[PDB]
């Protein structure tokens, strides 16, 4: 019946684990990008009617309420439905999608989809604090590792990486160089000034006056090959390929898009940056969750009626080169049209924001090269994949 | 947007905080109701297209992959995408709703919407633990009260309930009476054997004897207005009518419905219990979050073009006597048709589960009375309500 | 040059782990027995000039200051020196001794020696809270077990028990019956009303009005042999002899003695209950700390000029029957003159108070039987022993 | 009561809170200074009769057997009895004193008195962890501030220092000047190579380079009255003269002296550094705990029948500029003879260690100046002071 477009799209820069976003809570990162994406959209908060955020790890009680706090804190009416959502790595896109969905079904004609994730502030739980340990030592569980660990086989996503690396024969040397690359593309992209407009800086009050964060700090410009073959496989003793060097970072960030029913954009006469074409999810094997994008991507393409190499730009996420290389191959993607600015290996992987962050990236590149069609996807821990495609205006 | 129906809906009995379900995790709760819900629709693990599941507090790492784990452990196919949602109190319908939405948009025909919450096992968090609290006392955060506090004013929901009690003019006695009513209703409803149908029993085999749980132990059989009359109003210092007596409980439960497309359902030789007619969302003032159902509800009829008089059976969650009556006050509603069997005061309120939980109470009951139009709604923390209406077969 | 006597001697009754003393902090148990022992001594706090308490496990910051708080809280002048002291199991006597010592050397003529220990309130430390765990799960250390574990060989005192049980060939059956005995002697002693005057009750404000604790609750009057041979050795897999049944309890308590320079008692004309004869310490093997009493006892006897079987009454502590039996033997003590009311197995082992508690016991028995000479000793974890002897008036 | 002498006294340099000694435990600190102190007296492990050791905060289970572990790990005989003492700030002399007392009373002739404190490694406690905090936020207790809070008024020692500053009329500048004086004195004292003698260096071998620590890193060389002048008074809202600038530090250190009997010492061909002439204790008002040294001191001369004029060299611990001057004000004391080398402001104040620590500074220095009569005293939290005086050879 109906149609949805993206008026604005914006993000914080990405922090390193316990770096420059350390002291900034997901509620705050999120409120900001909400407020900023309105400004660009030239849109009042009064006239928004749904918000969805993706987040995984609760830093604090607000995060239970996170999507209402990001929305309300960033100017949106208290009269607006807001929902936080979790699909692990895919949460940010998924928030985009569930935002999309309500408009599609006429729940409203203005929706915001975003995400926020502050791994530096992930907590430790004390599972025995409520009802006590009578006796014997006890635990303080790292929730962040919690999040990075398959909930059936109690293993790290990096372990699942080895699996897909072996299943598709992606050698260490694919991964190390895919990584060295991601850095190149990012550092270049950064120097090239490519992200300036999509990034919203975070004014942080600090001693000696304020301090402001605008530049994705995970990326490395001295990017050497022998830098990053010096690493040893971190997730397995014998037969290792996956390293710190070739794996996703742990990172802090937010991201939002303002969306609209096409008509309402015309009635506003705002120039969107794209329409939603289609989207498709999937559950792949948990022990190889890293390829979920491939099935999801195949599905999404169908319902668009479009095919591979209709694809001007792809942002599909580098959880690990081991899986990113795999996902490129099985789909026969063209390396330099997939993550041309770099990805989770280079800028970082703020898990629950990532899906929404790269969206803002991808849309913003589309405007640089003025291609028409666009693909974002990522693998989701626990054996899932997500994907959407958009179409330049 | 071609029609969707529930083919089965099944749930646990409701634990009291630290009661029958103390030692039972959400993962295991969710997995049970899935497997059992799926049996009741005669549906295989491998036919299920999608899973959404409403939870709020994370109890352990696995809770982050909550819906996905409910699924697989419950015999569901790997292939299916799974999702966790948070909308606090409303989280449990949204699961039903968001999932509905996947059929409507023909992402699939076979999908499931559940909820799961174990307040028993709510953790405490150590926010200083990662980076350390260098000096000075630190905290351990009751995450379960965290869920139960409004994130803007940092005041308990019960406090908001006082505010609703004032505006809408409810008094200690109307709520106290209502509370008794819910309990009478509940104690009877079980005695009626009304709930045997829906409740999956929960086997947890103790050494030196093994036990089951299949009746909603929060219910105060053998109770009176005097018990209500007796309590001191807890949530505020001055002029307080709200007490633990008339308030919602703290509890543990899960619940799931299988849903289908008018076609796949008819084309499976499957009597449905009902069909999804519409749904309604609403953003309201955090301070009076208790009325969200009324706005969301007015919406809900309108979309379906129906009226208050029209509906046969009604499950609008009672978080509190004050709001729950104030909901009905402002919808003139038929009080004997309202929580025919009682609610969170009586059975209890394990919030992530509840939206899913009332729905089951509703659908099943619709059969008992053989009505046509049926309401499910509930208020939410932070300023929201949610509604959904369905009709028989 | 000088001489020291004991005017009064008093104690709380002993609580079980997490029993009736659960909510009572060592500062409070201690303040009480200080105040009470003055009353019996018919002595002002103004006229005390030194306090020493024995304690091991810090429940809270006060316990760093414990001896000043017990003293000051129980009426003693702020003008009085107060010191907390730790010699593990032997701390309570040791406090007696260090109290003694100052008077002997003319630091003052009125001194109090006591102890307090609340194992129910022992804490957990979070060793990584100050400077953080960057990453990975972490610990909450049980401090009570801390205290029960050799600090070289990181093994439980019960493990050291097996050692002494084997070194001296004390068979399980010695230990089980020594235990069944201790219970008899205690239950009998209790019914016999033997402790009434030495015990100070703890008025505890509670719902339904106050609740008061006066009766040592660890003791068991249904004392059966086959009750307590049903136990399995708790501290070792193969070759076990030591059990829960035949080992010391974990317990809560306090105890104080008022002491005096003889003269000052005469000048007061107070009737002491004994003079200090002599005292002797020792370091024995850590892996068999359980026999420290034997060497210490040998030493103490010398400096008195007295010999074994000058000994009307001995209280020498049952950390474990395995060690108590051993210590009886090597010294050829007469079973029924050693711990005639029972001991740590029966009433409990509030480690840091124990030394001072049994003192109050022993002195009080001396008055029952009117013997003249008296021996208290105990083994100290980590390879130590302590002992003193006193002389009826 | 025949004479006692120090044959050696040795110590560590003083860590800053979280500095050189971060990762060094009290057990290991204490063990070092013992072994080294014993070398300097030419004394074997197996000759030592007794050990007392002053500590306040327990950092790990082993700290409960603190003195015993200092001993054995430091080559001391098992046979020797060992003891831990707590008197907060004074804990470090008491060790010296209580031990002295064992020789005096001829319990032995060869014994040792130390102190050890690592404020770096102070734990945080979870008082609810054992029995659980069923509901509601709980706490994690900064045990190190716990040590630094008065247990009656729950106010910081620095607050008491303000009270002493008022009564005794010290001002921001006198203390600020004093502070500078201590620092000048200290920076010089090290430059003088005065401390090489006493300080045992501390080898902790890092991978990729191994490091030592043998100079008192708290000292602010290169500093000024301007730095003092600059600070905002931290400990109180109104009319405050006390700041981190002029206050004691938070630090890590250990220290031990071997002591003997005039006879065993002469009868071992051993030059002693000094001999114990007397000691003095004092209870005072918690609120002004800073003057305890003056009363304890007036006592101390009297017992020895000496006078203020009489003493050559003086180490009265400076917890604070305000008290430390107020001590001297009321003893008219010779300010250039007072902390000749500085104090807790300069070198620092790791409280359990400090009493032992100043003593060493004192004895050694007495040699440097070749005086006869030497003072060691310090105030204590909760309302006490402690003193001791010695003479050369």
From Swiss-Prot, chains A, B, C, D:
CDD domains: thiolase (cd00751). It comes from the Bacteria. Disruption phenotype: Mutants are impaired in their ability to produce PHBV when grown on propionate. The active site is at 89 (acyl-thioester intermediate), 349 (proton acceptor), 379 (proton acceptor). It catalyses: an acyl-CoA + acetyl-CoA = a 3-oxoacyl-CoA + CoA; 2 acetyl-CoA = acetoacetyl-CoA + CoA. It is an enzyme of class 2 (transferase). InterPro entries: Thiolase, Thiolase-like, Thiolase-like_BktB, Thiolase_acyl_enz_int_AS, Thiolase_AS, Thiolase_C, Thiolase_N. Transmembrane segments: none annotated. The keyword Acyltransferase applies. Its EC number is 2.3.1.16, 2.3.1.9. One of its GO terms (molecular function) is acetyl-CoA C-acetyltransferase activity. It holds the Pfam family Thiolase_N. Keywords: Acyltransferase, Transferase. Gene3D superfamilies: 3.40.47.10. Belongs to the thiolase-like superfamily. Thiolase family. NCBIfam families: AcCoA-C-Actrans, bketothiol_BktB, PRK09051.1. Required for efficient production of poly(beta-hydroxybutyrate-co-beta-hydroxyvalerate) (PHBV). Catalyzes the condensation of acetyl-CoA and propionyl-CoA to form beta-ketovaleryl-CoA, and the condensation of two acetyl-CoA molecules to form acetoacetyl-CoA. This is Beta-ketothiolase BktB. It comes from Cupriavidus necator (strain ATCC 17699 / DSM 428 / KCTC 22496 / NCIMB 10442 / H16 / Stanier 337) (Ralstonia eutropha).
């Amino acid at each position: 019946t109906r149609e949805v477009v993206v008026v604005s799209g914006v993000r914080t820069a990405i922090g390193t684990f316990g770096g420059s976003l350390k002291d900034v809570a997901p509620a705050e990162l999120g409120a900001l990008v909400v407020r900023e994406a309105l400004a660009r959209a030239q849109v009042s908060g009064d006239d928004v009617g749904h918000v969805v955020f993706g987040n995984v790890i609760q830093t604090e009680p607000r995060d239970m309420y996170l999507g209402r706090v990001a929305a309300v804190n960033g100017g949106v009416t208290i009269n607006a439905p807001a929902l936080t959502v979790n699909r692990l790595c895919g949460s940010g896109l998924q928030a985009i999608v569930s935002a999309a969905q309500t408009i599609l079904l006429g729940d409203t004609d203005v929706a915001i989809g975003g995400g926020a994730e502050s791994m530096s502030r992930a907590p430790y739980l004390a599972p025995a604090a409520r009802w006590g340990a009578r006796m014997g030592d006890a635990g303080l569980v790292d929730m962040m590792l919690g999040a990075l660990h398959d909930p059936f086989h109690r293993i790290h996503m990096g372990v699942t990486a080895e699996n897909v690396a072996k299943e598709y024969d992606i050698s260490r040397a694919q991964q190390d160089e895919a990584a060295l690359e991601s850095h190149r593309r990012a550092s270049a992209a950064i120097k090239a000034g490519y992200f300036k407009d999509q990034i919203v800086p975070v004014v942080s009050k600090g001693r000696k006056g304020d301090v402001t964060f605008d530049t994705d700090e995970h990326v490395r410009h001295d990017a050497t090959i022998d830098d990053m073959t010096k690493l040893r496989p971190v997730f397995v003793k014998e037969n290792g390929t996956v390293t710190a060097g070739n794996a996703s970072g742990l990172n802090d960030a937010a991201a939002a898009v303002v969306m609209m029913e096409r008509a309402e954009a015309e009635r506003r006469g705002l120039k969107p940056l794209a329409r939603l074409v289609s989207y498709g999810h999937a559950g792949v094997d948990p022990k190889a969750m890293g390829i979920g994008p491939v099935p999801a991507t195949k599905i999404a393409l169908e319902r668009a009626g479009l095919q591979v190499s209709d694809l001007d730009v792809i942002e599909a996420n580098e959880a690990f080169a081991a899986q990113a290389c795999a996902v490129t191959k099985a789909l026969g993607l063209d390396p330099a049209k997939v993550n041309p600015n770099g990805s989770g290996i280079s800028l970082g992987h703020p898990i629950g924001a990532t899906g929404a962050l790269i969206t803002v990236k991808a849309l913003h590149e589309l405007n640089r090269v003025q291609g028409r069609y666009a693909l974002v996807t990522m693998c989701i821990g626990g054996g899932q994949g997500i994907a959407a495609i958009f179409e330049r205006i």
